[PDB]
Design a protein around this ligand. Structure first.
Ligand SMILES: [K+]
Ligand SMILES: [K+]
Ligand SMILES: [K+]
Ligand SMILES: [K+]
Ligand SMILES: [K+]
Ligand SMILES: [K+]
Ligand SMILES: [K+]
Ligand SMILES: [K+]
Ligand SMILES: [K+]
Ligand SMILES: [K+]
Ligand SMILES: [K+]
Ligand SMILES: [K+]
Ligand SMILES: [K+]
Ligand SMILES: [K+]
Ligand SMILES: [K+]
Ligand SMILES: [K+]
Ligand SMILES: [K+]
Ligand SMILES: [K+]
Ligand SMILES: [K+]
Ligand SMILES: [K+]
Ligand SMILES: [K+]
Ligand SMILES: [K+]
Ligand SMILES: [K+]
Ligand SMILES: [K+]
Ligand SMILES: [K+]
Ligand SMILES: [K+]
Ligand SMILES: [K+]
Ligand SMILES: [K+]
Ligand SMILES: [K+]
Ligand SMILES: [K+]
Ligand SMILES: [K+]
Ligand SMILES: [K+]
Ligand SMILES: [K+]
Ligand SMILES: [K+]
Ligand SMILES: [K+]
Ligand SMILES: [K+]
Ligand SMILES: [K+]
Ligand SMILES: [K+]
Ligand SMILES: [K+]
Ligand SMILES: [K+]
Ligand SMILES: [K+]
Ligand SMILES: [K+]
Ligand SMILES: [K+]
Ligand SMILES: [K+]
Ligand SMILES: [K+]
Ligand SMILES: [K+]
Ligand SMILES: [K+]
Ligand SMILES: [K+]
Ligand SMILES: [K+]
Ligand SMILES: [K+]
Ligand SMILES: [K+]
Ligand SMILES: [K+]
Ligand SMILES: [K+]
Ligand SMILES: [K+]
Ligand SMILES: [K+]
Ligand SMILES: [K+]
Ligand SMILES: [K+]
Ligand SMILES: [K+]
Ligand SMILES: [K+]
Ligand SMILES: [K+]
Ligand SMILES: [K+]
Ligand SMILES: [K+]
Ligand SMILES: [K+]
Ligand SMILES: [K+]
Ligand SMILES: [K+]
Ligand SMILES: [K+]
Ligand SMILES: [K+]
Ligand SMILES: [K+]
Ligand SMILES: [K+]
Ligand SMILES: [K+]
Ligand SMILES: [K+]
Ligand SMILES: [K+]
Ligand SMILES: [K+]
Ligand SMILES: [K+]
Ligand SMILES: [K+]
Ligand SMILES: [K+]
Ligand SMILES: [K+]
Ligand SMILES: [K+]
Ligand SMILES: [K+]
Ligand SMILES: [K+]
Ligand SMILES: [K+]
Ligand SMILES: [K+]
Ligand SMILES: [K+]
Ligand SMILES: [K+]
Ligand SMILES: [K+]
Ligand SMILES: [K+]
Ligand SMILES: [K+]
Ligand SMILES: [K+]
Ligand SMILES: [K+]
Ligand SMILES: [K+]
Ligand SMILES: [K+]
Ligand SMILES: [K+]
Ligand SMILES: [K+]
Ligand SMILES: [K+]
Ligand SMILES: [K+]
Ligand SMILES: [K+]
Ligand SMILES: [K+]
Ligand SMILES: [K+]
Ligand SMILES: [K+]
Ligand SMILES: [K+]
Ligand SMILES: [K+]
Ligand SMILES: [K+]
Ligand SMILES: [K+]
Ligand SMILES: [K+]
Ligand SMILES: [K+]
Ligand SMILES: [K+]
Ligand SMILES: [K+]
Ligand SMILES: [K+]
Ligand SMILES: [K+]
Ligand SMILES: [K+]
Ligand SMILES: [Mg+2]
Ligand SMILES: [Mg+2]
Ligand SMILES: [Mg+2]
Ligand SMILES: [Mg+2]
Ligand SMILES: [Mg+2]
Ligand SMILES: [Mg+2]
Ligand SMILES: [Mg+2]
Ligand SMILES: [Mg+2]
Ligand SMILES: [Mg+2]
Ligand SMILES: [Mg+2]
Ligand SMILES: [Mg+2]
Lengths: 142, 79, 24, 129, 91, 97, 152
RNA sequence: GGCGCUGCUGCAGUUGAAACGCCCGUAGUUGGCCCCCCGCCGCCACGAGGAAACGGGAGCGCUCCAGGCAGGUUGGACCCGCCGCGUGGGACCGCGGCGGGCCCGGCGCGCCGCGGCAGCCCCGAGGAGAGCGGGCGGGGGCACCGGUACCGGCCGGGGACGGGUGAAACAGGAUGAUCCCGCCGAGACCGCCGGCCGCGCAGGCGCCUGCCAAGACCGCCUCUGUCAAUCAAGGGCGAAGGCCGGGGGCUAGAAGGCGAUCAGACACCACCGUAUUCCCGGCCGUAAACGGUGCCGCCCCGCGGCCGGCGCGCGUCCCGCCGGCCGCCCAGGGAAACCGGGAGGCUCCGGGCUCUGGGGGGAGUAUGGCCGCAAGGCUGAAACUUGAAGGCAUUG
């Protein structure tokens, strides 16, 4: 029947499934551990670091713009990442040595939109949420 | 016409292949022969492919032909 | 390229790498 | 090589009916096919059949009356507890009101309604409706 | 238990003389050490005594043959052709 | 590239390999069951001079010798010289000579 | 038939009468047909040909109908059975013949192909007879040993 | 979870990703029909025995409720551990000399025929193997052998150009070419006939004569008695090119050389030419090795053609049967092109077995291993990157 059958083939019906699961990119991506290694966050929702430089990023082929980002040095493992600073005007609140908190764009570490090479974003600067900081709910000291 | 497949026609069933009749049967049979030089009649296979003789004769009265067999100059019957 | 000739190119490259590793 | 003489019988019959034949010949026969045609008959989906003899595996001649949407076998004969019959009913039969799953049990070849009337289990053979 | 993997009887040479020569000698020396069937004796007892000289150790015939095998292919073909040419000279 | 012909462009039925023939126009190698083949029979003098030859012969009852030559071409040469034409999708199924 | 080791798919075979009884012309008795069977067995005719001989010269289509047993069982009953069974003997014989042809022809790969097929059938049949106890538990086919076993 | 994009239920494999180049073959998986009322497994039911809590579930107005076990003679019932143990079934699925008396409660162990038992064989598959007869065929191996042509040489005749191309130019020629005719040498090749012909496991297969063993099909009231199907590992074969060692060397001809063309032309076209093309002994193991379609088995509206064997008929024909190769085609199938001897009998899904795929790239690459003289082959990732790639079809 293009599949094996018969009452005494359970071992083969299990061997086939075990071998063919790895041909799915999602099962392999979530069960092989090489991504758990290559992941800058080491499998967490967020991580902190200090800002090392402010940069601008030229948008991808259809659009045209200069998005805003920061080069971040992670505290927990001493790695280099880039984080897109959202929400118009916020790039002023990111000084040259700040403790920033970094989370994702979604899509489990895939680029989003037209911003090339960035898979992370900053959500807190110096203990303050950047949403409220934009929305004038809290203010950085001086 | 309204034919029942469980009581078919013998003449049309015989035209068929022998394994594909309703009740499988043989094709061969047996037949009597009369000798030129002696009186008695002997019984022979319809598809003989081994030598067959004439009780006195040291000559052969049968020839293989791949199917039904021939006989060197005798005079036959069917029974 | 025509895949035939990409294949000929790749074979020459692998031959070059193998000669290179053979030293040391 | 041939494995399921009953599978081949049922396919032959459904082809013949789909054309619109009055009879059909299936070979070989066996005990199980005789049982299965008998259940088909007392449920009232087919007319006469006759088993004709050749000192061998026999032949069967079946009479058809245009009622049989489908008939088939389940290979392998999985084992069934008394409480899985309905999870097979809503899988194989078009409705809960007509159709038949066929079980072999230590108290005969029978359909599902009887297998529950006696609330026993068995191993499934086929289905028809 | 098997004692070498490939060299066979050329293991007597050690690491000397290179691969191609040792490959040729394995074949040659196996052929010249082999026992052959005596075309008279009926038995497989013919051994070489010098380059083209073969003696049956059972029936004691001596025969002239090849350098490293008892028969050669040119001699097989020549003997067949000479036999045919004789037979054609018989009318 | 779906399939264009049921015969795959050749007449090869129940075998693995068939012989090779050279094309007469360009000398390309073509398998025998694919090559385009024709047979011609023609006199060795044109008929516009066959009458003059036949009047000026001496042999009483002499006849003009014929010629029997089988031409075989590849597909390219056949189409280019118009032995065969590219056809409509319907017309491709016609085998009439 | 002709299907185990090629793409044959033929059906030519014999089909025997439904009715099981001797002929109206049968005057022989199990005694005398056994007489003929055993004279032929001594003379050296194999069981597959003994049936041909009594079908043709003696005019009996089936032997069990007249007697009640099968020709090889008659041979066993009166004590004239071969040590090796008949079709295994025929297969070994053909294997010997092809080996001997290859002793002169070294470049005949088609013959070597056929040799493999024949010997695979020989091993499979030897396994059946041996586990079925028609042949010693130590029985084996060896090409090198085979050629002289036929005389015995 | 959506996801039948992991598919036991229940995916896909002609062209979108995907059937191993083929044959043999062990483990594994699977295996026709038959006797019923015995034994041993599997299976089905019902029990026994062991934990609550959780999950269900009977009863109860913490005012309801998430709860809790309360409460007004009471109550907190009952279910739910299991490939083990017990009782019963026995359809399906496997596997398998006797009495009597000596003899005596049994049971063994022997003892005598001591006649009591019908003493002790399903059948012979539109499974398979074996046989006999008959024809059949570019199926295979070894020897031998004809024929023109291409190339080379020699005798003679005759006297100006010959070759080559789209057109030309480099090669050739009064040391007489090109052309005609006779003679000699060598190595390839096997035309027309030659095919919707045929054979082989595939790769493949075409001169004459001889020899050698095979093969499928048909015909058959011959033999046997399931001896089978498919197959990891393992073994054999395998176009062309390529490699090692011997031989041979006509044609053509990778490389190399040279005349043109051109902007360039190191290419296409012309000319010369080495390996190679041929034989013997090995090796290598790949092709759009293609029907882009795995093998065994069943059912299947019809009309034709050719090839092999058989039988009935009239007087070569004609009707049938088995096997093969092909065309067209109702139904049905499908995204369609198309298939239709299946790619049908499938969301109405389950005959058996083996292999392969899971968006496009990176990549058949890196790395390790096995094999190979080498050229390679076989096995074969990850990081990272991307919104599509792709099928069949319509109009321009
Ligand atoms: K499939
Ligand atoms: K599938
Ligand atoms: K499978
Ligand atoms: K099973
Ligand atoms: K799978
Ligand atoms: K007939
Ligand atoms: K028929
Ligand atoms: K017939
Ligand atoms: K027949
Ligand atoms: K007949
Ligand atoms: K016959
Ligand atoms: K390719
Ligand atoms: K390629
Ligand atoms: K290539
Ligand atoms: K395409
Ligand atoms: K083609
Ligand atoms: K054909
Ligand atoms: K052909
Ligand atoms: K051909
Ligand atoms: K043509
Ligand atoms: K062409
Ligand atoms: K086969
Ligand atoms: K068949
Ligand atoms: K074997
Ligand atoms: K013997
Ligand atoms: K899913
Ligand atoms: K689901
Ligand atoms: K499928
Ligand atoms: K394509
Ligand atoms: K691929
Ligand atoms: K394959
Ligand atoms: K594979
Ligand atoms: K295989
Ligand atoms: K096999
Ligand atoms: K096998
Ligand atoms: K097994
Ligand atoms: K299995
Ligand atoms: K099994
Ligand atoms: K099977
Ligand atoms: K059970
Ligand atoms: K039961
Ligand atoms: K407890
Ligand atoms: K148990
Ligand atoms: K029990
Ligand atoms: K029990
Ligand atoms: K022939
Ligand atoms: K032939
Ligand atoms: K011919
Ligand atoms: K031949
Ligand atoms: K040959
Ligand atoms: K030959
Ligand atoms: K000649
Ligand atoms: K010649
Ligand atoms: K011919
Ligand atoms: K022909
Ligand atoms: K021919
Ligand atoms: K042929
Ligand atoms: K032919
Ligand atoms: K033919
Ligand atoms: K032919
Ligand atoms: K087998
Ligand atoms: K196996
Ligand atoms: K196989
Ligand atoms: K294999
Ligand atoms: K293998
Ligand atoms: K090989
Ligand atoms: K090869
Ligand atoms: K090759
Ligand atoms: K080469
Ligand atoms: K040459
Ligand atoms: K080359
Ligand atoms: K170029
Ligand atoms: K070019
Ligand atoms: K040249
Ligand atoms: K070369
Ligand atoms: K050469
Ligand atoms: K070549
Ligand atoms: K050559
Ligand atoms: K090769
Ligand atoms: K391949
Ligand atoms: K391919
Ligand atoms: K093809
Ligand atoms: K396969
Ligand atoms: K014909
Ligand atoms: K014919
Ligand atoms: K034929
Ligand atoms: K014919
Ligand atoms: K014919
Ligand atoms: K015919
Ligand atoms: K037929
Ligand atoms: K047929
Ligand atoms: K055939
Ligand atoms: K066809
Ligand atoms: K066919
Ligand atoms: K199977
Ligand atoms: K396979
Ligand atoms: K595969
Ligand atoms: K594959
Ligand atoms: K694959
Ligand atoms: K798979
Ligand atoms: K490596
Ligand atoms: K090596
Ligand atoms: K080399
Ligand atoms: K190397
Ligand atoms: K290497
Ligand atoms: K596309
Ligand atoms: K594609
Ligand atoms: K494409
Ligand atoms: K379309
Ligand atoms: K489309
Ligand atoms: Mg066939
Ligand atoms: Mg799912
Ligand atoms: Mg040549
Ligand atoms: Mg091999
Ligand atoms: Mg040349
Ligand atoms: Mg040259
Ligand atoms: Mg070569
Ligand atoms: Mg291929
Ligand atoms: Mg044909
Ligand atoms: Mg390696
Ligand atoms: Mg479309």
């Amino acid at each position: 029947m293009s599949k094996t059958s018969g009452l005494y083939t359970a071992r083969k019906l299990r061997t086939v499934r075990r071998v063919n699961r790895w041909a799915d990119k999602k099962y392999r991506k979530a069960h092989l551990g090489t991504w758990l290694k290559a992941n800058p966050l080491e499998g967490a929702c967020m991580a902190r670091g200090i800002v090392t430089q402010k940069i601008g990023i030229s948008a991808k082929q259809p659009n045209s713009a200069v998005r805003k980002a920061v080069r971040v040095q992670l505290t927990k493992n001493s790695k280099k990442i880039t984080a897109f600073v959202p929400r118009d005007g916020s790039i002023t609140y990111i000084d040259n040595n700040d403790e920033v908190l970094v989370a994702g764009f979604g899509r489990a570490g895939r680029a989003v939109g037209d911003i090339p090479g960035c898979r992370f974003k900053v959500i807190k600067v110096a203990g303050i949420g950047l949403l409220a900081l934009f929305l004038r709910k809290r203010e950085k000291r001086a | 016409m309204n034919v029942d497949l469980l009581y078919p026609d013998p003449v049309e069933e015989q035209r068929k292949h022998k394994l594909k009749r309703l009740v499988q049967g043989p094709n061969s049979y047996f037949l009597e022969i009369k000798c030129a030089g002696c009186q008695d009649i002997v019984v022979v296979y319809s598809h003989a492919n081994t030598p067959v003789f004439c009780p006195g004769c040291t000559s052969q009265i049968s020839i293989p032909t791949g199917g039904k067999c021939a006989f060197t100059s005798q005079v036959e019957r069917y029974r | 390229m025509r895949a035939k000739w990409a294949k000929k190119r790749m074979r020459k490259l692998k031959r070059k790498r193998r000669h290179m590793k053979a030293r040391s | 090589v041939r494995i399921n003489v009953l599978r081949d019988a049922l396919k032959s019959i459904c082809n013949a009916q789909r054309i619109g034949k009055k009879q059909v010949i299936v070979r070989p026969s066996s005990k199980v096919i005789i049982e299965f045609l008998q259940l088909m008959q007392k449920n009232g989906y087919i007319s006469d059949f006759a088993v004709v003899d050749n000192h061998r595996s026999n032949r069967i001649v079946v009479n058809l009356i245009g009622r049989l949407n489908k008939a088939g076998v389940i290979s392998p004969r999985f084992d069934i507890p008394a409480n899985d019959i309905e999870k097979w009913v809503v899988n194989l039969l078009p409705s809960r009101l007509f159709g038949h799953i066929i079980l072999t049990t230590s108290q005969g070849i029978m359909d599902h309604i009887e297998a529950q009337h006696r609330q026993i289990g068995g191993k499934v053979i086929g289905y028809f409706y | 238990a098997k004692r070498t993997k490939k060299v066979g009887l050329t293991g007597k040479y050690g690491t000397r003389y290179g691969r191609a020569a040792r490959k040729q000698l394995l074949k040659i020396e196996t052929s010249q050490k082999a026992k052959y069937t005596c075309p008279f004796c009926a038995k497989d007892k013919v051994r070489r005594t010098a380059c083209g000289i073969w003696t049956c150790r059972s029936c004691s015939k001596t025969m002239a043959g090849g350098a490293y095998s008892l028969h050669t292919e040119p001699a097989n073909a020549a003997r067949a052709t000479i036999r045919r040419l004789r037979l054609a000279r018989e009318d | 590239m779906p399939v264009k012909r049921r015969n795959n462009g050749r007449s090869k039925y129940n075998c693995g390999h068939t012989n090779i023939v050279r094309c007469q126009n360009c000398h390309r190698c073509v398998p025998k069951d694919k090559v385009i083949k024709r047979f011609t029979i023609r006199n060795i003098v044109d008929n516009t001079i066959a009458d003059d030859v036949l009047n000026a012969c001496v042999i009483q009852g002499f006849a003009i010798p014929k010629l029997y030559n089988k031409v075989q071409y590849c597909v390219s040469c056949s189409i280019h010289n118009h032995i065969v034409r590219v056809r409509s999708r319907e017309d491709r199924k016609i085998r009439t000579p | 038939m002709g299907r185990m080791h090629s793409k044959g798919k033929g059906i030519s075979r014999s089909a025997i009468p439904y009715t099981r009884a001797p002929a109206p012309w049968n005057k022989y008795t199990p005694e005398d047909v056994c007489e003929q069977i055993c004279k032929l067995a001594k003379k050296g005719t194999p069981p597959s040909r003994i049936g041909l001989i009594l079908r043709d010269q003696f005019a009996i289509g089936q032997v069990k109908n007249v007697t009640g047993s099968k020709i090889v069982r008659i041979l066993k009953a009166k004590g004239l059975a071969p040590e090796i069974p008949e079709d295994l003997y025929c297969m070994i014989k053909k294997a010997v013949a092809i080996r001997k042809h290859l002793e002169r022809s070294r470049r005949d790969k088609d013959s070597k192909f056929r040799l493999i097929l024949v010997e695979s059938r020989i091993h499979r049949l030897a396994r059946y007879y041996r586990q079925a106890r028609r042949l010693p538990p130590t029985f084996r086919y060896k090409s090198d040993q085979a050629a002289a076993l036929l005389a015995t």
